[PDB]
Design a protein around this ligand. Structure first.
Ligand SMILES: Cc1nc2c(ccn2Cc2ccc(F)c(F)c2)c(-c2ccc3c(c2C)CCCO3)c1[C@H](OC(C)(C)C)C(=O)O
Ligand SMILES: Cc1nc2c(ccn2Cc2ccc(F)c(F)c2)c(-c2ccc3c(c2C)CCCO3)c1[C@H](OC(C)(C)C)C(=O)O
Ligand SMILES: C[As](C)(=O)[O-]
Ligand SMILES: C[As](C)(=O)[O-]
Ligand SMILES: C[As](C)(=O)[O-]
Ligand SMILES: C[As](C)(=O)[O-]
Lengths: 140, 140
């Protein structure tokens, strides 16, 4: 679909929170392990994401995630609006984390290894290749 | 120069550490405010960076930054090797942080606003546009 659409959701593992952003058109993922599921953590994650990619619109499976003043400020400043692929990309990431978990002490390390594996896996291009292609083409 | 080359250095501000990664060929920046200047923080940052972009080689102005076992493990796993633009990109970021600093409570928020401003500024393409173009072209 549209190249500026991202989906953001949190998932829970080992008593920690993983914020997962999916670029809907490519299946590319960005993720961070956050101390708590708060509006200030979501706002900070959104500022980082928007500085890296041309973020136009954000989707989520939990609308209340985006009600804080912190989040609304991040979206206002960065010029962001609110509105099977995402379910599939999140499923694949949770399974990859499980598969690499014993290779690291920290959950956050296993998460970043799973993001890397996911983005680099060709399906024939990878999600990492598709995002860069989708965004470059849209610039032209 | 080569599209897989990144430069990583830390800078200090308000008693905190900012890890700054520059994509040498585009001038694109990624940055994080880290609790301390440690090998484990650098290793974690490198895993995140390598999952997002095709990182081949890393440069730094402080070689001792990359001696820890943590860093060597991150580079080994991600398949990374060691070897005016970077000085210019870091200079521009420090000045942008100064210019936006009073708009936020936290230094980390001002840092991410400065990264966003820097990557989106056209010079006529922006660093954010150039990185995506350089990487997409290299895939083809
Ligand atoms: C926490 C951590 N420590 C690491 C390392 C590597 C060496 N050390 C030092 C050390 C010393 C004594 C040990 F008994 C011991 F087990 C590890 C990684 C690490 C770093 C990068 C990395 C991998 C590991 C395990 C796995 C493959 C992907 O890349 C870690 C690591 O944590 C940080 C990334 C935060 C450094 C971890 O969670 O295990
Ligand atoms: C820490 C923080 N709090 C924020 C917000 C916004 C509302 N609030 C709540 C609040 C409540 C009462 C206040 F007196 C008060 F001043 C702010 C931003 C924030 C979030 C996004 C953002 C901006 C700000 C100021 C500036 C432009 C770029 O986008 C913050 C912010 O910190 C996080 C990003 C970690 C949430 C900050 O450092 O100020
Ligand atoms: C995105 As959840 C807090
Ligand atoms: C608040 As968001 C768009
Ligand atoms: C890159 As500095 C620790
Ligand atoms: C250790 As690095 C390449």
């Amino acid at each position: 679909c549209s190249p500026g659409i991202w989906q953001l959701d949190c998932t829970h593992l080992e008593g920690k929170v993983i914020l997962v952003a999916v670029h809907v058109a490519s299946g590319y993922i960005e993720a961070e392990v956050i101390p708590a599921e708060t509006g200030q953590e979501t706002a900070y994650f959104l500022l980082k994401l928007a500085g890296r990619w041309p973020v136009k619109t954000i989707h989520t499976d939990n609308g209340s995630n985006f009600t804080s003043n912190s989040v609304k400020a991040a979206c206002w400043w960065a010029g962001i609006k609110q509105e099977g692929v995402v379910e599939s990309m999140n499923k694949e990431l949770k399974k990859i984390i499980g598969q690499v978990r014993d290779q690291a002490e920290h959950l956050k390390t296993a998460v970043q290894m799973a993001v890397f594996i996911h983005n680099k896996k060709r399906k024939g291009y990878s999600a990492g290749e598709r995002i860069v292609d989708i965004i470059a083409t849209d610039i032209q």
